[PDB]
């Protein structure tokens, strides 16, 4: 949601899943029953373009089967030279879904979300929020 926002302007490209079910679009529509699913091995991917230069405050994220995830952030005019952010590693809640507040600086054009491992074969994200303001 906020910064990520399709809406917003923002647009979620280079996902290692494509399914027609569960299309990557789906993790920044604002709506938390949809989702991105994966569909074969690890690790797993997408990035996030804001198609303008953020400086982000919070991250969010609502999830499921997701154990260990990378967050890395470019600042490039392309999705390239990206850099470590944030590494974590999710807890497996039965019967109910991932949210993950994550409170950390960082200036930004791309975002890179991996989900290096999952709790099961397949892992989903249902939202990726940033908290934040645009910088012209
Ligand atoms: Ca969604
Ligand atoms: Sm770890």
Known sequence: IDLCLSSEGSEVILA????????????????????????????????????????????????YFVQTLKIEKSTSKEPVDFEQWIEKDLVHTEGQLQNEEIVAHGSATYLRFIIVSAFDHFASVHSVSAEGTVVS
């Open 16 to 63: 290692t899943s494509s399914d027609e079910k569960h299309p990557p679009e789906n993790i920044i529509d604002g709506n938390p029953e949809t989702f991105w699913t994966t569909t074969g091995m690890f690790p797993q991917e997408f990035i996030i373009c804001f198609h303008k230069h953020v400086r982000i405050e919070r991250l969010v994220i609502q999830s």
